[PDB]
Each structure stands twice: as structure tokens, then as C-alpha cells.
């Protein structure tokens, strides 16, 4: 259930969603994220990084393979 961030993602400045900061995980390139279950209809994984859980966009991350 591990994914690697291919880009930096700062939801506060980069999210297109109004609740992005509060609901989406911030990460930098090369961070490894713990994903639970599968990606939702919106294209977001539910993930964990540094003691925090939140939505993770699939297009910013790559599954470990």
C-alpha cells in the first residue's frame, strides 16, 4: 500500500478545492505515502504521511511496483 510522490504538493497554495488545506495531504517529491483501499471516483487515494491522514491525488503519486 505504498506510493511515492512524483511532485511537491502544497494544498494551501495548489489545491483547486476550497477545503483542500484541511482535507488533503501535503507532501514533497520523494515522500512515501501509506494508502488504504483504492482510489475513489474523484481520483483521490485515502493516505497517511507523518502522523496525518488525508486525500491524495493519484496524478501526483506513483505506486511502488
Amino acid at each position: 500500500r505504498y506510493f511515492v510522490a512524483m511532485f511537491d504538493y502544497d494544498p494551501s497554495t495548489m489545491s483547486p478545492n476550497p477545503d483542500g488545506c484541511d482535507e488533503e495531504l501535503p507532501f514533497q517529491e520523494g515522500d512515501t505515502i501509506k494508502v488504504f483501499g483504492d482510489k475513489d471516483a474523484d481520483g483521490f487515494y485515502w493516505g497517511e504521511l507523518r502522523g496525518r491522514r488525508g486525500y491524495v491525488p493519484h496524478n501526483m503519486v506513483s505506486e511502488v511496483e
Binding site: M14, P16, N59
Partner: peptide, 11 residues
């Protein structure tokens, strides 16, 4: 809920 843009200067 909407997906973010991949920054073009990083891609």
C-alpha cells in the same frame, strides 16, 4: 472534488 494541476515547470 477536483484533481490538482501538475506544475508545468516541474513536469
Amino acid at each position: 472534488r477536483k484533481l490538482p494541476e501538475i506544475p508545468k515547470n516541474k513536469k
